[PDB]
Amino acid sequence: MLIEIHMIQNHSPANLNRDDLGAPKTCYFGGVLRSRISSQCIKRSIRTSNDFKALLGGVRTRRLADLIQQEAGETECWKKAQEILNKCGFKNKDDNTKMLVFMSKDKIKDLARIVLDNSLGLTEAAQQVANVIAQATLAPDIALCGRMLEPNDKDKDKKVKWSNTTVEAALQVAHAISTHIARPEIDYFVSMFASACFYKYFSIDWEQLVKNLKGDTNLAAHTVGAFLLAAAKTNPSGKHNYPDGILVEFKNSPISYANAFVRPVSVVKESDLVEQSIGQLSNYVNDIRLGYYDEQSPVIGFWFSPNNRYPLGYKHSKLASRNIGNLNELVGAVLDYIGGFKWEEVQKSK
Amino acid sequence: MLIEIHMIQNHSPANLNRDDLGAPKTCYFGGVLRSRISSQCIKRSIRTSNDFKALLGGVRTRRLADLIQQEAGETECWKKAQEILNKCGFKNKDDNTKMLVFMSKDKIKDLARIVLDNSLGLTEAAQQVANVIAQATLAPDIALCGRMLEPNDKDKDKKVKWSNTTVEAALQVAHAISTHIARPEIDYFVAADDVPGEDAGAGHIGESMFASACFYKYFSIDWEQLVKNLKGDTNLAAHTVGAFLLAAAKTNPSGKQNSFAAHNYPDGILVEFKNSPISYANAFVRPVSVVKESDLVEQSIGQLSNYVNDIRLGYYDEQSPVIGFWFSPNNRYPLGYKHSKLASRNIGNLNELVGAVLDYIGGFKWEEVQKSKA
Amino acid sequence: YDEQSPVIGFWFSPNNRYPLGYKHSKLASRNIGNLNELVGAVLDYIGGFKWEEVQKSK
Amino acid sequence: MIYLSRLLIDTGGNPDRPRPGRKWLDNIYNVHRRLSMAFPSGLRREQDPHFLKPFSPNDFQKTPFLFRVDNNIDGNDKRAIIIVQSVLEPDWDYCFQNALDFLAAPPETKEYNPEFKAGQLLRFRLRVNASVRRHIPEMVQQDGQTIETGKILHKRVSLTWDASSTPDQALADWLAAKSPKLGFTLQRCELLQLGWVYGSKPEPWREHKYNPLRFRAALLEGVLEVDDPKLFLKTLSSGIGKAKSFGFGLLSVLPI
């Protein structure tokens, strides 16, 4: 099945994304301009957070020869590794390579073992190195973010071959869009700034996560729980600012509630921006509940608010199965629907 | 009688269809730039969909001999099949023939029998393969999208003859266009090298292009040609129509959707049955401009309502009645907001919209139509 | 030409969606809002042929 | 009677159209040169009044000029903002008479005059590069193993903080430490841009060379208090930090 998390959060502009010109990212949605948080920004912010630090099993390196010279101790295995990587296909422009390698933190030792071994030639070393960095997949970060690693062919030996160096992603993160029109800064041609209301949509494929992790189940459950905790407990760059409301549902087809905010939630009062947005979401959800979700497989959902402050049921519609107020209880409630999955026993897996 | 599906669907910021340079597909309509989603992409997303997976009896292959080997068993048949296909009219310059064969249907077992038949030589075996490729004629996606292949006459020794291949497809898909000015945006991405380095550290600097738009999609199914292309089997025809309607209603192109997840659903579906095909893209010749007290989707539906009412009143023939089914999600945006009841009925859910479409088509239902998997 | 032959013209738009010019009118002798009525008016000016019995010619 | 105006840059629209303004802002020296030429010497206007000659900076005059790179006046249009000030009269019809593709709207200018009082509140945005002059051990080659000599190189390291300190109050403490020297006192300030700023420089048969210009910029905003009005008039049009000529010293005179 597919787990979909729609959260409403308040994010100050001092803790957001930027383009090459220092501008906060903006997108044209519904004909009006909105503040945007890029999907890769949320992805790396979840990756480098404290909650996901136990599952940071992947590395993205242009300088792999430095990682080769981290455990051997002997000085003279840096140039040999560089020539091995050049013969595999990765160009030698500087101490770093020209391509980005998505690796895992258990084959670096094997790479150093192959490099330090002097009983084999350069071509067989390149073949063994490709066999190493083509199955380096057993990492939850690799499973979530996906991988597309690909070598250069003009500067590669004709005998060394490459296996399937492509792992398809299991995480579909939408670009976060502000429900309101983005607040203009004070034009200077004449605690400080109000946080913007952001809608985030994360889709995780359970099946794609479990074939990306070679069938390992409790590691994937720990990955999902830590991802939810990191999504509700992060702030991209800098820096509790808890999300205003989290809806988690489980269906077989992806659905985006972004069209709730085709009409901007244009509220003059600053304190009414959040709950009105929640109301708008409920309206659209109800329509998507009725206009598309009948028969076949009914979808169930769990709603979360800080101590149940902002409900989403319009006080009569049971479109959310339960409204809970604890984030860890939300993680437990979404873990046990997939089957068993006690959160207290899932942390003992990488 | 002609089945017509018009859809209004607002997408989140994404890049559903890209060119070789990564730019989203634009078009110049009404003198202004619109976001374009190609009809081929919609056709593939329909064909490679969850609901339209029971009718995917159509394969487009250059690796034909490897399927022959796959279902031929442990016997080695690649070389003889390659020679037979070479003299049949499919040249081979590598480990792939340069001829996309839409023989499609799952009678690969017949081609296997001709290939492994150690009783006839290569010429009449090529003839018996050629007369079984020409009689594909089945599976719903060939009735929807036909064939073109014409062997090769710089090869294919003249002792072997060939038969008809063209299927004369019954599905017409317009390229989906936006109702307003295309707004393409630059996105900045970095790689952010994980290990510490001497510099600030970013493994890759580059640009990506995306956009957000409200698309109008147009599908036309010629019911009689679709029945003729299936050689009868009206139940398979109705299953094709219903699966096409449901799959087009819930599917999106998979281009760049892992980072631009925009699985939004349509807000307006106008299904109309009539003898002549009509495209309402002229409704959006003028771009939709956002008004302060309404949204872009509602304005697009209003412009569609105005143009559809004008078209029905201006092209009305008493001997050819024109009807309409209007579906909105839980009646979110009614079509005739101003004065008119344009559609014969407004329908709140997709399932009985499909059921009413099948009721008009032949009075068939959605339940017993499922049996013809083919 | 403004005299002798007066050039009779008919303007058809779907439900009069587009008027033939927002300037001074009477450029077209009849602003017809239907195609079948335009065919009937054309056949009437050709000499009074109704659409029904010309269909029986072939 | 200071000279405050606005230059307006698109940074948007169709990505397929090559926009020379976008690469104009993506380097320090380009905007520095273009705004430096924006106060030409008076004899050149008498000689060539049409901006139609190969220029030379020796013919130009030198003034401690300064600008500000901002963006995003919203209202359904992303747009980029250049705020310039110096001491002499600039010209905008002379400067961008062939560079209409650089801008997205014609520039505008009015007369502005600043006033200051004692113990009066203010609102400000500044940009100062994080620069701490330090003695470092040299670290060169990096060919597999580290190699150092006893020489201690002298440069300006970017600001670093201890692991038990967030960047926010670290830069707040920097601004609090630098406040009483320059002539003001604050109660709180907000960090909203910490990052890296990159550039390159050409210099004099000869060749051209590229070296990555490096600056740890820090743009802040919000609520200023003063201790004396006389300690602020010498701060405007001069700068308070480093990279003074590079556009890192504008005092936002918005008393509110």
Rounded CA separation D26/D6 (Å): 19
- Nearest residue to B9 (alpha-carbon basis) of B206, B248, B322: B248
Decide if D196 and B209 are in contact by the 8 Å CB cutoff. no
Contacts of A101 (CB under 8 A, 6+ apart): A60, A61, A62, A64, A90, A133, A149
Structure tokens at B121: 């030589």
Structure tokens at D19: 């926009």
Decide if B316 and C12 are in contact by the 8 Å CB cutoff. no
Burial class, A331, CB count within 10 angstroms (exposed 0-12 / middle 13-18 / buried 19+): buried
CB D189 within 8 A of CB D172: yes
**Helix B350-361 vs helix B234-249: crossing angle, to nearest 10:** 150
Rounded CA separation A131/A153 (Å): 17
User: Distance, in angstroms, between B325 CA and closest chain D CA?
Assistant: 36
Identify all chain C residues contacting B313, using CB atoms and an 8 Å cutoff: 14-15, 33-34
**Residue A14 at interface with chain D, using a CB cutoff of 8 Å:** yes
Helix, strand counts (H, E) of chain A: 10, 13
Least CB–CB distance from D15: residue in B184, B199, B200: B184
CB D123 within 8 A of CB D224: yes
Rounded CA separation A333/B150 (Å): 60
User: Distance, in angstroms, between B259 CA and closest chain A CA?
Assistant: 6
CB A55 within 8 A of CB A141: yes
- Closest-CA residue of B relative to A97 is B203
Decide if D15 and B23 are in contact by the 8 Å CB cutoff. yes
User: Distance, in angstroms, between D155 CA and closest chain A CA?
Assistant: 24
CB D25 within 8 A of CB D70: no
Alpha helices, H only, B134-292:
140-144, 223-229, 234-249
Angle at D212 between CA D210 and CA D216, to 5 degrees: 160
User: Distance, in angstroms, between C4 CA and closest chain B CA?
Assistant: 33
Contact: chain C with chain D (3+ CB pairs below 8 Å): no
Structure tokens at B332: 């979110």
Rounded CA separation A65/A111 (Å): 10
Rounded CA separation D13/B185 (Å): 7
Rounded CA separation A230/A38 (Å): 16
User: What are the φ and ψ backbone dihedral angles of B243, each rounded to 5 degrees?
Assistant: -65, -35
Rounded CA separation B278/B315 (Å): 11
Chain pair A-D, CB pairs under 8 angstroms = 87
CB A129 within 8 A of CB A82: no
Q: How are beta strands A300-304 and A322-324 bridged, if at all?
A: parallel
Rounded CA separation C22/A71 (Å): 84
**Residue B184 at interface with chain D, using a CB cutoff of 8 Å:** yes
CB C7 within 8 A of CB B286: no
Structure tokens at B310: 């004008």
- Nearest residue to D19 (alpha-carbon basis) of D100, D86, D82, D95: D100
Decide if A262 and B297 are in contact by the 8 Å CB cutoff. yes
Rounded CA separation B55/A186 (Å): 58
Least CB–CB distance from D222: residue in A18, A182, A192: A192
User: Distance, in angstroms, between D41 CA and closest chain A CA?
Assistant: 27
- Nearest residue to B295 (alpha-carbon basis) of D166, A32, D3: A32
Report how far apart, in Å, the C-alpha atoms of C46 and of each of C38, C39, C54, C57, D104 are: 12, 10, 12, 16, 60
Decide if B351 and A262 are in contact by the 8 Å CB cutoff. no
**Positions of E strands within B200-315:** 205-211, 214-222, 268-274
**Positions of E strands within chain D:** 5-9, 66-71, 80-85, 108-109, 121-122, 125-127, 132-137, 152-157, 190-194, 197-199, 213-215, 218-221, 224-225
List b or e across C16-38, with b for residues whose CB sees 16 or more CB atoms inside 10 angstroms: beeeeeeeeeeeeeeebbbeeeb
Rounded CA separation A113/A92 (Å): 21
- Nearest residue to B148 (alpha-carbon basis) of B102, B90, B217: B102
**N residues, chain D:** 256
CB A28 within 8 A of CB B183: yes
Query: Which residues does chain B break after (C to N > 2.5 Å)?
Result: none
- Nearest residue to B145 (alpha-carbon basis) of B48, B61, B43, B254: B43
Rounded CA separation A170/B300 (Å): 35
Structure tokens at D253: 């005179």
DSSP structural state of residue B74:
S
DSSP structural state of residue A23:
P
- What separation, in Å, do the N-terminal and C-terminal C-alpha atoms of chain C show? 38
- Nearest residue to A171 (alpha-carbon basis) of A123, A120, A228, A133: A228
Decide if D76 and A24 are in contact by the 8 Å CB cutoff. no
> Which H or E element spans position B296?
helix B296-314
Structure tokens at D192: 């909203």
**Residue A32 at interface with chain D, using a CB cutoff of 8 Å:** yes
Burial class, D106, CB count within 10 angstroms (exposed 0-12 / middle 13-18 / buried 19+): exposed
**Residue B23 at interface with chain D, using a CB cutoff of 8 Å:** yes
Alpha helices, H only, chain A:
39-47, 64-68, 79-88, 108-116, 122-132, 140-145, 206-212, 218-232, 273-291, 327-335
Structure tokens at B280: 């309402």
Q: Cβ of D35: how many Cβ atoms within 10 Å?
A: 20
Rounded CA separation A149/A89 (Å): 11
Chains that touch B (3 or more CB pairs under 8 A): A, C, D
- Closest-CA residue of B relative to C17 is B310
Decide if D80 and A21 are in contact by the 8 Å CB cutoff. yes
Which amino acid is present at D75? G
Strand partners, B345: B325
User: Distance, in angstroms, between B304 CA and closest chain C CA?
Assistant: 13
DSSP structural state of residue B24:
B
Rounded CA separation B100/A344 (Å): 55
Identify all chain B residues contacting C37, using CB atoms and an 8 Å cutoff: none
Rounded CA separation C12/D182 (Å): 79
Residue from B16, B34, B45, B188 to probe the interface with A (highest A Cβ count within 10 Å): B188
Structure tokens at D105: 């709207």
Rounded CA separation C44/B149 (Å): 52
3-state secondary structure at position B277: coil
* Residue whose tokens read 């009841």: B341
Strand partners, A246: A7, A304
User: What are the φ and ψ backbone dihedral angles of A25, each rounded to 5 degrees?
Assistant: -70, 135
Rounded CA separation B331/B350 (Å): 12
Angle at D187 between CA D183 and CA D192, to 5 degrees: 100
CB A245 within 8 A of CB A9: no
**Residue D142 at interface with chain B, using a CB cutoff of 8 Å:** yes
**Residue D76 at interface with chain A, using a CB cutoff of 8 Å:** yes
Least CB–CB distance from C14: residue in B315, B317, B318: B315
User: What are the φ and ψ backbone dihedral angles of B18, each rounded to 5 degrees?
Assistant: -125, 160
Alpha helices, H only, B73-199:
78-88, 108-116, 122-133, 140-144
Strand partners, D254: D123
CB D5 within 8 A of CB D92: yes
User: Distance, in angstroms, between A307 CA and closest chain B CA?
Assistant: 30
Decide if D6 and A186 are in contact by the 8 Å CB cutoff. no
List b or e across B339-350, with b for residues whose CB sees 16 or more CB atoms inside 10 angstroms: eeebbeebbbbb
Residue from C10, C15, C51 to probe the interface with B (highest B Cβ count within 10 Å): C15
| Distance from chain centroid for Cα A148 | 16
- Closest-CA residue of D relative to B209 is D15
Strand partners, B59: none
Rounded CA separation A106/A128 (Å): 15
Report how far apart, in Å, the C-alpha atoms of A245 and of each of A7, A307, D123 are: 5, 10, 34
User: Distance, in angstroms, between A311 CA and closest chain D CA?
Assistant: 32
**Residue D111 at interface with chain A, using a CB cutoff of 8 Å:** no
Structure tokens at C26: 């009477």
Q: What is the CA radius of gyration of chain C?
A: 14
- Nearest residue to B170 (alpha-carbon basis) of B285, B314, B2, B23: B2
Decide if A254 and B263 are in contact by the 8 Å CB cutoff. yes
Decide if B313 and C14 are in contact by the 8 Å CB cutoff. yes
DSSP structural state of residue A184:
P
Q: Cβ of A93: how many Cβ atoms within 10 Å?
A: 9
CB D88 within 8 A of CB D63: yes
CB D187 within 8 A of CB D225: yes
DSSP structural state of residue A350:
-
Rounded CA separation A226/A46 (Å): 9
Contact: chain D with chain B (3+ CB pairs below 8 Å): yes
Strand partners, B172: B220
CB B181 within 8 A of CB B287: yes
Rounded CA separation A76/A105 (Å): 22
Identify all chain B residues contacting C17, using CB atoms and an 8 Å cutoff: 307, 310, 314
Identify all chain D residues contacting A31, using CB atoms and an 8 Å cutoff: 76
> Which H or E element spans position D35?
helix D28-37
Taking CB atoms within 8 Å and a gap of at least 24, the contacts of B74-81 are: B75/B116, B77/B112, B77/B115, B77/B116, B80/B115, B80/B116, B80/B122, B81/B111, B81/B115
Burial class, B290, CB count within 10 angstroms (exposed 0-12 / middle 13-18 / buried 19+): middle
CB A226 within 8 A of CB A349: no
Rounded CA separation B363/B40 (Å): 31
Decide if D15 and B200 are in contact by the 8 Å CB cutoff. no
List b or e across B125-138, with b for residues whose CB sees 16 or more CB atoms inside 10 angstroms: bbbbbbebbeebeb
Chain pair A-B, CB pairs under 8 angstroms = 144
Rounded CA separation B339/B372 (Å): 43
Rounded CA separation B289/A5 (Å): 32
Alpha helices, H only, B48-94:
64-72, 78-88
* Residue whose tokens read 């500067």: A155
CB B147 within 8 A of CB B165: yes
Q: How was this structure determined?
A: cryo-EM
Least CB–CB distance from A31: residue in B250, B290, B351: B290
Which amino acid is present at B261? A
Burial class, A176, CB count within 10 angstroms (exposed 0-12 / middle 13-18 / buried 19+): buried
| Distance from chain centroid for Cα B18 | 17
- What residues in chain B have their Cβ under 8 A from chain C's Cβ atoms? 307, 309-311, 313-318
Contacts of A333 (CB under 8 A, 6+ apart): A302, A322, A324
Chains that touch C (3 or more CB pairs under 8 A): B
Structure tokens at D27: 């380097």
- Nearest residue to A201 (alpha-carbon basis) of B95, B259, D85, C30: B259
Structure tokens at A6: 């729609």
User: Distance, in angstroms, between A243 CA and closest chain B CA?
Assistant: 21
> Which H or E element spans position B26?
strand B26-29
Least CB–CB distance from A173: residue in B210, B261, B263: B261
Resolution in A: 3.0
User: Distance, in angstroms, between A115 CA and closest chain D CA?
Assistant: 14
Decide if B207 and D15 are in contact by the 8 Å CB cutoff. yes
Burial class, A217, CB count within 10 angstroms (exposed 0-12 / middle 13-18 / buried 19+): middle
Which amino acid is present at C15? N
Structure tokens at A327: 């984030």
